[PDB]
Design an enzyme around this catalytic site. Sequence first.
Site, PDB file in Angstrom:
ATOM      1  N   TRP A 133       0.845  -1.186   0.000  1.00  7.45           N
ATOM      2  CA  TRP A 133       0.000   0.000   0.000  1.00  7.45           C
ATOM      3  C   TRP A 133       0.885   1.242   0.000  1.00  7.45           C
ATOM      4  O   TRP A 133       1.787   1.353   0.840  1.00  7.45           O
ATOM      5  CB  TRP A 133      -0.887  -0.068   1.237  1.00  7.45           C
ATOM      6  CG  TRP A 133      -1.952   0.941   1.362  1.00  7.45           C
ATOM      7  CD1 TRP A 133      -2.885   1.277   0.431  1.00  7.45           C
ATOM      8  CD2 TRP A 133      -2.236   1.724   2.522  1.00  7.45           C
ATOM      9  NE1 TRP A 133      -3.731   2.235   0.935  1.00  7.45           N
ATOM     10  CE2 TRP A 133      -3.353   2.527   2.219  1.00  7.45           C
ATOM     11  CE3 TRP A 133      -1.654   1.823   3.790  1.00  7.45           C
ATOM     12  CZ2 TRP A 133      -3.894   3.423   3.131  1.00  7.45           C
ATOM     13  CZ3 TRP A 133      -2.193   2.709   4.693  1.00  7.45           C
ATOM     14  CH2 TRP A 133      -3.302   3.500   4.361  1.00  7.45           C
ATOM     15  N   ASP A 214      -0.458  -5.085   9.881  1.00  5.49           N
ATOM     16  CA  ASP A 214      -1.506  -4.232   9.329  1.00  5.49           C
ATOM     17  C   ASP A 214      -2.637  -5.159   8.881  1.00  5.49           C
ATOM     18  O   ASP A 214      -2.470  -5.946   7.945  1.00  5.49           O
ATOM     19  CB  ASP A 214      -0.947  -3.380   8.191  1.00  5.49           C
ATOM     20  CG  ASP A 214      -1.993  -2.486   7.547  1.00  5.49           C
ATOM     21  OD1 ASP A 214      -3.197  -2.675   7.816  1.00  5.49           O
ATOM     22  OD2 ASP A 214      -1.609  -1.595   6.757  1.00  5.49           O
ATOM     23  N   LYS A 249     -13.422  -1.741   5.838  1.00  5.53           N
ATOM     24  CA  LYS A 249     -13.847  -2.609   4.753  1.00  5.53           C
ATOM     25  C   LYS A 249     -14.775  -3.715   5.235  1.00  5.53           C
ATOM     26  O   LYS A 249     -15.816  -3.945   4.613  1.00  5.53           O
ATOM     27  CB  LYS A 249     -12.610  -3.168   4.041  1.00  5.53           C
ATOM     28  CG  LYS A 249     -11.844  -2.101   3.226  1.00  5.53           C
ATOM     29  CD  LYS A 249     -10.493  -1.751   3.861  1.00  5.53           C
ATOM     30  CE  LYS A 249      -9.702  -0.659   3.091  1.00  5.53           C
ATOM     31  NZ  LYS A 249      -8.290  -0.549   3.648  1.00  5.53           N
TER      32      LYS A 249
END
Lengths: 399, 399
Positions: A133, A214, A249
């Site tokens: 990312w 993460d 999400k």
Amino acid sequence: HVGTFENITAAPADPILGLADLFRADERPGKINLGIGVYFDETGKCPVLTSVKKAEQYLLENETTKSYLGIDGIPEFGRCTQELLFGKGSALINDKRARTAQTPGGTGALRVAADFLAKNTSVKRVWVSNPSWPNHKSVFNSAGLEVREYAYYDAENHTLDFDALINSLNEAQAGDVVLFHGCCHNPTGIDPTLEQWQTLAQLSVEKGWLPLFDFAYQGFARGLEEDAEGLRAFAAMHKELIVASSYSKNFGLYNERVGACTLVAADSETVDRAFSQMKAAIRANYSNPPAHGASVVATILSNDALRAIWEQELTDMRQRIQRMRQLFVNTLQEKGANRDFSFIIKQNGMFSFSGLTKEQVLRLREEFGVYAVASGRVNVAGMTPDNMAPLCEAIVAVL
Amino acid sequence: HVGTFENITAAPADPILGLADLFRADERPGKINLGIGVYFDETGKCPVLTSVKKAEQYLLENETTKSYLGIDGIPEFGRCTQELLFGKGSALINDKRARTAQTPGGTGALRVAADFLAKNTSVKRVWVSNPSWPNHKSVFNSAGLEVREYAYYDAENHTLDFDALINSLNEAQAGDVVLFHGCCHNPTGIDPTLEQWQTLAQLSVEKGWLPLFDFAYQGFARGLEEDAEGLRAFAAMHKELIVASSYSKNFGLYNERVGACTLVAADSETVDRAFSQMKAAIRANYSNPPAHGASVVATILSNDALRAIWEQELTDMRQRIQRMRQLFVNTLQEKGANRDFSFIIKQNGMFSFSGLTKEQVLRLREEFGVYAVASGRVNVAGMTPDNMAPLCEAIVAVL
Ligand SMILES: Cc1ncc(COP(=O)(O)O)c(C=O)c1O
Ligand SMILES: *Cc1c(COP(=O)(O)O)cnc(C)c1O
């Protein structure tokens, strides 16, 4: 008296967001957006989950005050988070070795960790995967931490290059942070197997790394418990780790900024000492966290009835994406692609590297109105039965 | 391997938020909370405003997505914020000289400004009033800026020491940042007159300061427009300035984290160039801001029928505080105080500097269960007709 703002250099375009303003401007009919990382349903919309609407109705009727939360947020939220990550009855919880702060999204959790580490430890270096990312490097650099990259993706075989990952981490020293994606690696969709996770856990212990997980997509690979197997393998062996997690999400709560930073140390006394400094880092940033999104998550997770609805909505999302992965591959063949795209089926989550070049990603945009990130990452959750044939005809044209 | 967290030192308590923790744990039924700056009504509760409940009900029934906001948040929230700050028809607005980012509270707006200055300019020092909000120093220090103090309060005459202030600031160099409270100075409640504001604006220009206005109480002194007079005098003369504003208190939206950082430059090109870097600093912090509280604010300010309700609710809060200031002074004389406390009538906002010593404040807490900040700052909005007598009896007992 020159102006303080005159020597400022303009910032470049965000790779994921500089695309989405450019899409809102495209006036061509039938344009397709495979860019930002939100889930769409079969109609091309990003809806509010039913369980979230039910929770919000309850909050509207029952909230009596908006008075400040504590620095670390809603307590029930932290408890539910730890159970999700580590398992009910985890030894980390019973031994009280973990503390959790509610943060503004997963990004906020990464930034809080970065500021805490920079100010209170001898950490100087964070290792992240190549690719990752793009905002990882920006978050850690904002605290003044050096970010180095380790090898990860075998672009020839569309697989994890595990030998190169190991070799590239040879120079990561004791006390360096190594960042791992818990599941649904962003952007490749390739995750370690359980045996590879276990190998990494052992290596991490021997070399003295501080693991930072993460965890933005728990529930999107195989399931809620299955997706945490790698973290729990690390957690079984490590005295210390950090977890930045996101509910953006898996609850569809993107714009309410619901995340958590979880600190783990050798024992209760150490983690409480450390957590007091994490709270000081939060106080000097945004003071205390936003209530609405985290109240929703805590309400859903604390209520058997609402949680059963949510877990089914999460399964529905996961299964749609997998259905689209198969349909994408089949339709590319139907439309005449000679390149083999079957690796797409093996990849987890919303995102796969298509293998397209920056030059082909540009031709898709300008010539066909199909929008993907310039790395070739396409959002599979943005594909629908209605847009799949045009989308595949476009890819085949630029191949 | 010895742990990364093993040698961390524990952080001291927050002088405001640590007090709230003590207050929760205190088991005495008569305890009185005059610490944290939240509004209480005549019954001792911190209510949700009616305008806010109505806006939240609208949002529940009409929101169709939680998809990410842009980095700078809701556009209509930014437009409404600028109108409130500079006035409908301001030349800063028509010249397109101002850009606003929605932020997580006033605190988040302060940290975003500080990060933006530290990383993109030559700014090295921020000047802050003595006394000020205790968190000002932590926010600016955590971004890497030096904090210097300028004189403000005359503790003998309970007034603004304007000669001391100006001579203190003759040491601030060009390109330094000087922080001003827009109205309702925290903690003293003493604000400049319009004529003093105009003196400071002229002087600010001559010396080359970058003004940073912290605007957390617009509406609590005299009125929405009147409370912006000092800022608007600055905006009339300066090429550049920064406003960090908060909606926590004038909307009672504390825990939803609703604030704004507004950048002003000499022209449209410069502000957009500067704003692009501010967006980068936000992206590397919390990515994008929480929607619920800002959406409530924008719904209210965008609807004349909700806005009218909200304006009356704010007026009622402001007037209730004024009634308690008078009741407080009158009751102290009735309970046997021999000192003159009439200076409390001349202070604006939630907070009055009571003149009590640290030792007297400690005795108020331990012996009487009355909680005030160790500086002797008292929250007048925590006073009610029912708790006024015991509160004043306690204060007289420690004089
Ligand atoms: C002067 C001042 N600045 C900033 C703040 C912080 O506002 P917020 O709670 O919205 O972060 C406060 C409120 O506590 C304040 O009094
Ligand atoms: C999307 C994403 C984030 C950001 O999560 P937010 O909750 O939106 O801040 C962090 N890490 C990874 C790997 C992501 O994909």
